[model samples]
Target: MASLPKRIIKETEKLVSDPVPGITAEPHDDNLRYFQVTIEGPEQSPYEDGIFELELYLPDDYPMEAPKVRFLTKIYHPNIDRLGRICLDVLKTNWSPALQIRTVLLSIQALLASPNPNDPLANDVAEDWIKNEQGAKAKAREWTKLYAKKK
Candidate 1:
Protein backbone atom coordinates (compact mmCIF):
# COMPACT_ATOMS: atom_id res chain seq x y z
CA MET A 1 0.00 0.00 0.00
CA ALA A 2 1.14 3.54 -0.59
CA SER A 3 2.21 5.58 2.40
CA LEU A 4 0.39 8.68 3.51
CA PRO A 5 1.59 12.06 2.34
CA LYS A 6 4.19 13.81 4.50
CA ARG A 7 1.84 16.73 5.16
CA ILE A 8 -0.90 14.41 6.36
CA ILE A 9 1.45 12.35 8.48
CA LYS A 10 2.92 15.40 10.15
CA GLU A 11 -0.49 16.94 10.76
CA THR A 12 -1.79 13.76 12.39
CA GLU A 13 1.24 13.48 14.60
CA LYS A 14 0.92 17.04 15.77
CA LEU A 15 -2.79 16.67 16.45
CA VAL A 16 -2.15 13.72 18.76
CA SER A 17 0.78 15.30 20.56
CA ASP A 18 -0.46 18.85 20.99
CA PRO A 19 -4.24 18.85 20.82
CA VAL A 20 -6.11 22.12 21.00
CA PRO A 21 -7.87 22.85 24.29
CA GLY A 22 -11.62 22.15 24.17
CA ILE A 23 -11.16 20.43 20.82
CA THR A 24 -10.21 16.81 20.18
CA ALA A 25 -9.66 14.98 16.90
CA GLU A 26 -8.62 11.49 15.98
CA PRO A 27 -8.00 10.12 12.53
CA HIS A 28 -9.75 6.90 11.58
CA ASP A 29 -7.53 3.83 11.70
CA ASP A 30 -8.79 2.58 8.35
CA ASN A 31 -8.40 5.92 6.64
CA LEU A 32 -5.95 8.47 8.00
CA ARG A 33 -7.57 11.15 5.87
CA TYR A 34 -10.83 11.00 7.77
CA PHE A 35 -11.24 12.20 11.34
CA GLN A 36 -13.85 12.39 14.07
CA VAL A 37 -13.89 15.63 15.99
CA THR A 38 -15.45 17.17 19.05
CA ILE A 39 -15.46 20.76 20.24
CA GLU A 40 -16.54 22.09 23.60
CA GLY A 41 -18.94 25.01 23.59
CA PRO A 42 -17.02 28.21 24.08
CA GLU A 43 -17.23 29.88 27.48
CA GLN A 44 -19.56 32.89 27.73
CA SER A 45 -21.61 31.59 24.80
CA PRO A 46 -25.20 30.49 25.00
CA TYR A 47 -24.10 27.03 23.92
CA GLU A 48 -21.77 26.73 26.90
CA ASP A 49 -21.70 23.34 28.65
CA GLY A 50 -22.54 21.61 25.41
CA ILE A 51 -20.27 19.42 23.36
CA PHE A 52 -20.49 19.60 19.58
CA GLU A 53 -19.36 16.84 17.27
CA LEU A 54 -17.91 17.29 13.79
CA GLU A 55 -16.41 15.41 10.88
CA LEU A 56 -13.24 16.39 9.04
CA TYR A 57 -11.92 14.87 5.88
CA LEU A 58 -8.82 15.84 4.02
CA PRO A 59 -9.03 15.49 0.29
CA ASP A 60 -6.28 14.06 -1.90
CA ASP A 61 -5.38 17.63 -2.83
CA TYR A 62 -5.40 18.86 0.73
CA PRO A 63 -3.14 21.83 1.48
CA MET A 64 -4.17 22.89 -2.00
CA GLU A 65 -7.87 22.40 -1.31
CA ALA A 66 -9.66 23.18 1.91
CA PRO A 67 -10.63 20.30 4.17
CA LYS A 68 -14.25 19.23 4.13
CA VAL A 69 -15.95 19.79 7.50
CA ARG A 70 -19.47 19.52 8.81
CA PHE A 71 -21.17 19.51 12.15
CA LEU A 72 -22.35 16.12 13.39
CA THR A 73 -24.00 17.43 16.53
CA LYS A 74 -27.08 19.55 16.17
CA ILE A 75 -26.33 23.19 16.92
CA TYR A 76 -28.69 26.15 16.71
CA HIS A 77 -26.72 28.87 15.06
CA PRO A 78 -27.21 31.17 12.13
CA ASN A 79 -24.04 29.95 10.46
CA ILE A 80 -24.96 26.27 10.72
CA ASP A 81 -27.90 24.55 9.11
CA ARG A 82 -30.16 21.62 10.07
CA LEU A 83 -28.09 19.43 7.77
CA GLY A 84 -24.95 20.47 9.68
CA ARG A 85 -23.46 22.59 6.88
CA ILE A 86 -21.29 25.46 7.99
CA CYS A 87 -20.89 28.80 6.20
CA LEU A 88 -17.48 29.93 7.24
CA ASP A 89 -15.27 31.93 4.88
CA VAL A 90 -12.04 30.22 5.88
CA LEU A 91 -13.50 26.90 4.84
CA LYS A 92 -14.38 28.38 1.50
CA THR A 93 -13.30 31.61 -0.16
CA ASN A 94 -10.55 32.33 2.32
CA TRP A 95 -8.99 28.91 2.14
CA SER A 96 -5.22 29.02 1.92
CA PRO A 97 -2.60 26.33 1.41
CA ALA A 98 -0.74 27.65 4.43
CA LEU A 99 -3.64 26.71 6.74
CA GLN A 100 -3.56 23.47 8.73
CA ILE A 101 -5.91 21.16 10.63
CA ARG A 102 -5.24 22.94 13.89
CA THR A 103 -6.00 26.30 12.34
CA VAL A 104 -9.32 25.13 10.90
CA LEU A 105 -10.41 23.64 14.21
CA LEU A 106 -9.52 26.85 16.00
CA SER A 107 -11.54 28.82 13.44
CA ILE A 108 -14.49 26.51 14.02
CA GLN A 109 -14.12 26.85 17.80
CA ALA A 110 -14.22 30.60 17.40
CA LEU A 111 -17.32 30.32 15.20
CA LEU A 112 -19.14 28.60 18.03
CA ALA A 113 -18.23 31.43 20.32
CA SER A 114 -19.51 34.05 17.90
CA PRO A 115 -22.36 33.28 15.51
CA ASN A 116 -22.70 35.89 12.78
CA PRO A 117 -26.28 36.46 11.75
CA ASN A 118 -25.52 38.71 8.81
CA ASP A 119 -23.71 36.04 6.85
CA PRO A 120 -25.95 33.10 7.55
CA LEU A 121 -26.43 29.79 5.85
CA ALA A 122 -29.77 29.23 7.51
CA ASN A 123 -31.96 32.17 6.66
CA ASP A 124 -34.84 31.28 8.96
CA VAL A 125 -32.57 31.05 11.94
CA ALA A 126 -30.93 34.31 10.96
CA GLU A 127 -34.25 36.07 10.65
CA ASP A 128 -35.34 34.71 14.01
CA TRP A 129 -32.05 35.86 15.45
CA ILE A 130 -32.77 39.41 14.36
CA LYS A 131 -36.48 39.42 15.17
CA ASN A 132 -36.01 38.24 18.71
CA GLU A 133 -32.46 38.10 19.94
CA GLN A 134 -33.48 36.71 23.32
CA GLY A 135 -35.70 34.07 21.82
CA ALA A 136 -32.96 33.01 19.43
CA LYS A 137 -30.51 32.66 22.28
CA ALA A 138 -33.02 30.67 24.29
CA LYS A 139 -33.60 28.36 21.36
CA ALA A 140 -29.87 27.90 20.91
CA ARG A 141 -29.62 26.87 24.57
CA GLU A 142 -32.67 24.66 24.22
CA TRP A 143 -31.20 22.83 21.24
CA THR A 144 -27.87 22.54 22.98
CA LYS A 145 -29.51 20.75 25.89
CA LEU A 146 -31.60 18.60 23.58
CA TYR A 147 -28.91 17.54 21.10
CA ALA A 148 -25.56 18.58 22.51
CA LYS A 149 -25.95 16.98 25.94
CA LYS A 150 -23.08 14.66 26.81
CA LYS A 151 -24.00 11.05 27.11
Candidate 2:
Protein backbone atom coordinates (compact mmCIF):
# COMPACT_ATOMS: atom_id res chain seq x y z
CA MET A 1 0.00 0.00 0.00
CA ALA A 2 2.80 2.41 0.87
CA SER A 3 4.62 1.80 -2.41
CA LEU A 4 1.47 2.00 -4.56
CA PRO A 5 0.86 5.26 -6.41
CA LYS A 6 -1.65 7.77 -5.03
CA ARG A 7 -3.57 7.83 -8.29
CA ILE A 8 -4.05 4.07 -8.24
CA ILE A 9 -5.19 4.18 -4.66
CA LYS A 10 -7.73 6.86 -5.45
CA GLU A 11 -8.92 4.96 -8.50
CA THR A 12 -9.34 1.76 -6.51
CA GLU A 13 -11.15 3.64 -3.78
CA LYS A 14 -13.60 5.17 -6.18
CA LEU A 15 -14.17 1.82 -7.86
CA VAL A 16 -15.29 0.44 -4.52
CA SER A 17 -17.26 3.47 -3.44
CA ASP A 18 -18.97 4.58 -6.62
CA PRO A 19 -18.58 1.79 -9.10
CA VAL A 20 -19.83 2.07 -12.66
CA PRO A 21 -23.16 0.42 -13.44
CA GLY A 22 -22.87 -3.30 -14.18
CA ILE A 23 -19.10 -3.16 -13.72
CA THR A 24 -16.95 -4.18 -10.77
CA ALA A 25 -13.18 -3.93 -10.31
CA GLU A 26 -11.32 -5.26 -7.29
CA PRO A 27 -7.60 -5.10 -6.71
CA HIS A 28 -5.78 -8.24 -5.69
CA ASP A 29 -4.68 -8.37 -2.07
CA ASP A 30 -1.04 -9.14 -2.83
CA ASN A 31 -0.76 -6.98 -5.91
CA LEU A 32 -2.42 -3.59 -5.80
CA ARG A 33 -1.51 -3.06 -9.43
CA TYR A 34 -3.54 -6.07 -10.58
CA PHE A 35 -7.31 -5.99 -10.65
CA GLN A 36 -10.08 -8.55 -11.16
CA VAL A 37 -12.86 -7.07 -13.22
CA THR A 38 -16.34 -8.16 -14.29
CA ILE A 39 -18.65 -6.51 -16.79
CA GLU A 40 -22.29 -7.33 -17.40
CA GLY A 41 -23.15 -7.36 -21.08
CA PRO A 42 -25.19 -4.37 -22.22
CA GLU A 43 -28.88 -4.91 -22.82
CA GLN A 44 -30.21 -5.19 -26.41
CA SER A 45 -26.87 -6.63 -27.50
CA PRO A 46 -26.12 -10.18 -28.50
CA TYR A 47 -24.04 -10.49 -25.36
CA GLU A 48 -26.93 -9.55 -23.15
CA ASP A 49 -27.62 -11.71 -20.06
CA GLY A 50 -23.95 -12.53 -19.87
CA ILE A 51 -21.26 -11.76 -17.33
CA PHE A 52 -17.71 -11.37 -18.56
CA GLU A 53 -14.59 -11.54 -16.46
CA LEU A 54 -11.35 -9.77 -17.29
CA GLU A 55 -8.02 -9.07 -15.74
CA LEU A 56 -6.67 -5.52 -15.64
CA TYR A 57 -3.14 -4.60 -14.70
CA LEU A 58 -1.60 -1.20 -14.27
CA PRO A 59 1.86 -1.16 -15.80
CA ASP A 60 4.81 0.48 -14.07
CA ASP A 61 4.19 3.58 -16.18
CA TYR A 62 0.44 3.61 -15.81
CA PRO A 63 -1.68 6.71 -16.51
CA MET A 64 1.03 7.68 -19.02
CA GLU A 65 0.49 4.29 -20.64
CA ALA A 66 -2.84 2.51 -20.80
CA PRO A 67 -3.53 -0.45 -18.51
CA LYS A 68 -3.24 -3.96 -19.88
CA VAL A 69 -6.62 -5.73 -19.84
CA ARG A 70 -7.67 -9.11 -21.23
CA PHE A 71 -10.80 -11.19 -21.04
CA LEU A 72 -10.69 -14.30 -18.89
CA THR A 73 -14.16 -15.37 -19.93
CA LYS A 74 -14.54 -16.51 -23.51
CA ILE A 75 -16.41 -14.19 -25.88
CA TYR A 76 -17.20 -13.87 -29.56
CA HIS A 77 -16.62 -10.38 -30.83
CA PRO A 78 -14.93 -8.82 -33.84
CA ASN A 79 -12.75 -6.48 -31.74
CA ILE A 80 -11.79 -9.21 -29.27
CA ASP A 81 -9.58 -12.03 -30.48
CA ARG A 82 -9.30 -15.69 -29.45
CA LEU A 83 -6.44 -14.85 -27.11
CA GLY A 84 -8.67 -12.33 -25.33
CA ARG A 85 -6.71 -9.30 -26.53
CA ILE A 86 -8.87 -6.30 -27.34
CA CYS A 87 -8.73 -3.92 -30.29
CA LEU A 88 -10.04 -0.82 -28.59
CA ASP A 89 -8.40 2.44 -29.68
CA VAL A 90 -8.12 3.91 -26.21
CA LEU A 91 -6.29 0.81 -25.05
CA LYS A 92 -3.74 1.53 -27.73
CA THR A 93 -3.02 4.69 -29.75
CA ASN A 94 -5.79 6.85 -28.33
CA TRP A 95 -4.80 6.35 -24.70
CA SER A 96 -4.49 9.44 -22.55
CA PRO A 97 -3.32 9.97 -19.00
CA ALA A 98 -6.60 11.64 -18.15
CA LEU A 99 -8.49 8.39 -18.65
CA GLN A 100 -9.30 6.42 -15.51
CA ILE A 101 -10.05 2.76 -14.84
CA ARG A 102 -13.76 3.51 -14.77
CA THR A 103 -13.71 5.08 -18.21
CA VAL A 104 -11.68 2.28 -19.70
CA LEU A 105 -14.06 -0.38 -18.35
CA LEU A 106 -16.99 1.62 -19.63
CA SER A 107 -15.40 1.73 -23.05
CA ILE A 108 -15.04 -2.04 -23.02
CA GLN A 109 -18.69 -2.47 -22.03
CA ALA A 110 -19.70 -0.16 -24.85
CA LEU A 111 -17.62 -2.23 -27.25
CA LEU A 112 -19.73 -5.27 -26.37
CA ALA A 113 -22.76 -3.27 -27.38
CA SER A 114 -21.28 -1.94 -30.60
CA PRO A 115 -18.72 -4.07 -32.39
CA ASN A 116 -16.98 -2.60 -35.45
CA PRO A 117 -16.38 -5.18 -38.15
CA ASN A 118 -14.44 -2.63 -40.24
CA ASP A 119 -11.77 -2.47 -37.54
CA PRO A 120 -11.41 -6.03 -36.38
CA LEU A 121 -9.08 -8.09 -34.28
CA ALA A 122 -10.66 -11.38 -35.27
CA ASN A 123 -10.67 -11.55 -39.05
CA ASP A 124 -13.01 -14.53 -39.34
CA VAL A 125 -15.47 -13.08 -36.87
CA ALA A 126 -15.38 -9.73 -38.67
CA GLU A 127 -15.94 -11.40 -42.01
CA ASP A 128 -18.91 -13.27 -40.63
CA TRP A 129 -20.30 -10.10 -39.10
CA ILE A 130 -19.93 -8.14 -42.31
CA LYS A 131 -21.28 -10.89 -44.56
CA ASN A 132 -24.17 -12.03 -42.38
CA GLU A 133 -24.88 -9.86 -39.36
CA GLN A 134 -27.76 -12.03 -38.17
CA GLY A 135 -25.70 -15.18 -38.31
CA ALA A 136 -22.89 -13.41 -36.52
CA LYS A 137 -25.20 -12.22 -33.77
CA ALA A 138 -26.62 -15.72 -33.38
CA LYS A 139 -23.15 -17.15 -32.95
CA ALA A 140 -22.29 -14.45 -30.44
CA ARG A 141 -25.41 -15.24 -28.41
CA GLU A 142 -24.68 -18.95 -28.53
CA TRP A 143 -21.15 -18.37 -27.30
CA THR A 144 -22.48 -16.16 -24.54
CA LYS A 145 -24.89 -18.85 -23.42
CA LEU A 146 -22.14 -21.46 -23.41
CA TYR A 147 -19.36 -19.39 -21.84
CA ALA A 148 -20.57 -16.27 -20.09
CA LYS A 149 -23.34 -17.75 -17.98
CA LYS A 150 -22.97 -17.05 -14.27
CA LYS A 151 -22.10 -20.07 -12.17
Candidate 3:
Protein backbone atom coordinates (compact mmCIF):
# COMPACT_ATOMS: atom_id res chain seq x y z
CA MET A 1 0.00 0.00 0.00
CA ALA A 2 1.19 3.51 -0.71
CA SER A 3 1.95 5.71 2.27
CA LEU A 4 0.43 9.16 2.87
CA PRO A 5 2.63 11.77 1.23
CA LYS A 6 4.21 14.55 3.29
CA ARG A 7 2.34 17.08 1.15
CA ILE A 8 -0.95 15.59 2.34
CA ILE A 9 0.12 15.74 5.96
CA LYS A 10 0.99 19.42 5.68
CA GLU A 11 -2.23 20.31 3.91
CA THR A 12 -4.33 18.42 6.43
CA GLU A 13 -2.60 20.16 9.31
CA LYS A 14 -3.10 23.61 7.83
CA LEU A 15 -6.73 22.77 7.04
CA VAL A 16 -7.39 22.30 10.76
CA SER A 17 -4.91 24.66 12.39
CA ASP A 18 -5.95 27.68 10.36
CA PRO A 19 -9.33 26.66 9.06
CA VAL A 20 -11.05 28.71 6.40
CA PRO A 21 -13.96 30.87 7.47
CA GLY A 22 -17.38 29.34 6.66
CA ILE A 23 -15.58 26.11 5.87
CA THR A 24 -14.52 23.18 8.03
CA ALA A 25 -13.05 19.75 7.33
CA GLU A 26 -11.58 16.86 9.26
CA PRO A 27 -9.73 13.74 8.18
CA HIS A 28 -10.90 10.29 9.24
CA ASP A 29 -8.52 8.62 11.67
CA ASP A 30 -8.49 5.32 9.82
CA ASN A 31 -8.18 6.94 6.42
CA LEU A 32 -6.17 10.12 6.31
CA ARG A 33 -6.89 10.52 2.60
CA TYR A 34 -10.62 10.98 3.23
CA PHE A 35 -12.19 14.10 4.67
CA GLN A 36 -15.61 15.23 5.83
CA VAL A 37 -16.25 18.83 4.87
CA THR A 38 -18.84 21.51 5.47
CA ILE A 39 -19.18 24.92 3.81
CA GLU A 40 -21.62 27.59 4.87
CA GLY A 41 -23.30 29.39 1.99
CA PRO A 42 -22.22 32.89 1.01
CA GLU A 43 -24.18 35.90 2.27
CA GLN A 44 -26.04 36.99 -0.88
CA SER A 45 -26.80 33.78 -2.68
CA PRO A 46 -29.75 31.38 -2.81
CA TYR A 47 -27.50 28.99 -0.92
CA GLU A 48 -27.25 31.44 1.95
CA ASP A 49 -28.47 30.17 5.32
CA GLY A 50 -27.65 26.61 4.36
CA ILE A 51 -24.79 24.40 5.42
CA PHE A 52 -23.60 22.00 2.74
CA GLU A 53 -21.68 18.81 3.36
CA LEU A 54 -19.11 17.23 1.04
CA GLU A 55 -16.75 14.31 0.81
CA LEU A 56 -13.20 14.69 -0.44
CA TYR A 57 -10.42 12.23 -1.04
CA LEU A 58 -6.87 12.74 -2.14
CA PRO A 59 -5.82 10.13 -4.68
CA ASP A 60 -2.50 8.34 -4.34
CA ASP A 61 -1.05 10.58 -7.03
CA TYR A 62 -2.67 13.66 -5.45
CA PRO A 63 -1.26 17.05 -6.56
CA MET A 64 -0.75 15.45 -9.97
CA GLU A 65 -4.42 14.41 -10.14
CA ALA A 66 -7.12 16.58 -8.67
CA PRO A 67 -8.78 15.32 -5.51
CA LYS A 68 -12.17 13.66 -5.90
CA VAL A 69 -14.92 15.75 -4.33
CA ARG A 70 -18.69 15.49 -4.24
CA PHE A 71 -21.59 16.96 -2.39
CA LEU A 72 -23.20 14.81 0.27
CA THR A 73 -25.98 17.31 0.93
CA LYS A 74 -28.26 18.01 -1.99
CA ILE A 75 -28.01 21.41 -3.68
CA TYR A 76 -29.77 22.99 -6.63
CA HIS A 77 -27.52 24.82 -9.06
CA PRO A 78 -27.12 24.99 -12.80
CA ASN A 79 -23.58 23.69 -12.62
CA ILE A 80 -24.23 20.84 -10.20
CA ASP A 81 -25.98 17.67 -11.32
CA ARG A 82 -28.66 15.69 -9.43
CA LEU A 83 -26.03 13.16 -8.46
CA GLY A 84 -23.90 15.97 -6.96
CA ARG A 85 -21.25 16.07 -9.67
CA ILE A 86 -19.99 19.61 -10.06
CA CYS A 87 -19.00 21.30 -13.31
CA LEU A 88 -15.95 23.27 -12.32
CA ASP A 89 -12.96 23.74 -14.54
CA VAL A 90 -10.41 23.59 -11.77
CA LEU A 91 -11.75 20.22 -10.75
CA LYS A 92 -11.10 19.03 -14.27
CA THR A 93 -8.89 20.15 -17.15
CA ASN A 94 -7.74 23.34 -15.49
CA TRP A 95 -6.47 21.49 -12.45
CA SER A 96 -2.81 22.03 -11.69
CA PRO A 97 -0.35 20.29 -9.42
CA ALA A 98 0.18 23.57 -7.56
CA LEU A 99 -3.41 23.73 -6.33
CA GLN A 100 -4.33 22.49 -2.86
CA ILE A 101 -7.43 21.44 -0.94
CA ARG A 102 -8.20 24.94 0.34
CA THR A 103 -8.20 26.43 -3.15
CA VAL A 104 -10.55 23.73 -4.40
CA LEU A 105 -12.95 24.30 -1.51
CA LEU A 106 -12.84 28.05 -2.12
CA SER A 107 -13.69 27.50 -5.75
CA ILE A 108 -16.66 25.34 -4.76
CA GLN A 109 -17.82 28.02 -2.35
CA ALA A 110 -17.58 30.58 -5.12
CA LEU A 111 -19.59 28.32 -7.38
CA LEU A 112 -22.39 28.41 -4.81
CA ALA A 113 -22.26 32.19 -4.99
CA SER A 114 -22.32 32.27 -8.78
CA PRO A 115 -24.12 29.53 -10.64
CA ASN A 116 -23.05 29.47 -14.31
CA PRO A 117 -25.85 28.43 -16.62
CA ASN A 118 -24.03 29.24 -19.87
CA ASP A 119 -21.82 26.21 -19.43
CA PRO A 120 -23.92 23.84 -17.43
CA LEU A 121 -23.58 20.34 -16.06
CA ALA A 122 -27.26 20.21 -15.18
CA ASN A 123 -28.79 21.19 -18.51
CA ASP A 124 -32.42 21.20 -17.35
CA VAL A 125 -31.65 23.48 -14.45
CA ALA A 126 -29.64 25.71 -16.78
CA GLU A 127 -32.62 25.96 -19.09
CA ASP A 128 -34.85 26.98 -16.21
CA TRP A 129 -32.29 29.53 -15.07
CA ILE A 130 -32.05 31.03 -18.56
CA LYS A 131 -35.83 31.07 -19.08
CA ASN A 132 -36.65 32.43 -15.63
CA GLU A 133 -33.78 33.54 -13.42
CA GLN A 134 -36.01 34.44 -10.50
CA GLY A 135 -37.86 31.14 -10.63
CA ALA A 136 -34.61 29.21 -10.74
CA LYS A 137 -33.21 31.03 -7.71
CA ALA A 138 -36.44 30.38 -5.85
CA LYS A 139 -36.20 26.68 -6.63
CA ALA A 140 -32.60 26.63 -5.43
CA ARG A 141 -33.61 28.31 -2.18
CA GLU A 142 -36.39 25.79 -1.72
CA TRP A 143 -34.01 22.89 -2.19
CA THR A 144 -31.52 24.50 0.19
CA LYS A 145 -34.19 24.62 2.87
CA LEU A 146 -35.18 21.03 2.28
CA TYR A 147 -31.72 19.51 2.04
CA ALA A 148 -29.24 21.89 3.68
CA LYS A 149 -30.94 23.30 6.72
CA LYS A 150 -28.62 24.94 9.26
CA LYS A 151 -27.99 22.86 12.34
Candidate No. with top TM-score: 2
lDDT, candidates in the order shown: 0.87, 0.89, 0.88
> For residues 1-151, could you state the per-residue lDDT of candidate 3 as single tens digits?
3344688888988987898989989888888889999999999899998999999999888888899998898988888787778888898888999899999999999989988899834578899999999999999889989999685
What is the TM-score of each predicted model, taking all chains together?
Answer: 0.93, 0.94, 0.93
Q: Which portions of model 2 miss their true places by more than 4 Å? A: 1-4, 120-122
| Model 1 vs. true fold: TM | 0.93
RMSD of each: 1.8, 1.7, 1.7
Better of 2 and 3 by lDDT: 2
> Model 1: clashing residue pairs?
none
Worst 10 residues of 3 by lDDT: 1-10
Highest lDDT: which candidate? 2
What is the C-alpha lDDT profile of model 2 across 74-115, one tens digit per residue?
Answer: 998998888888888888888998899898999999999999
The lDDT-based order of candidates, best leading, equals 2, 3, 1
* Residues 50-77 of candidate 1: C-alpha lDDT, one tens digit per residue: 9999999998888888999989998889
Model 1 scores worst on lDDT over the 10 consecutive residues at 1-10
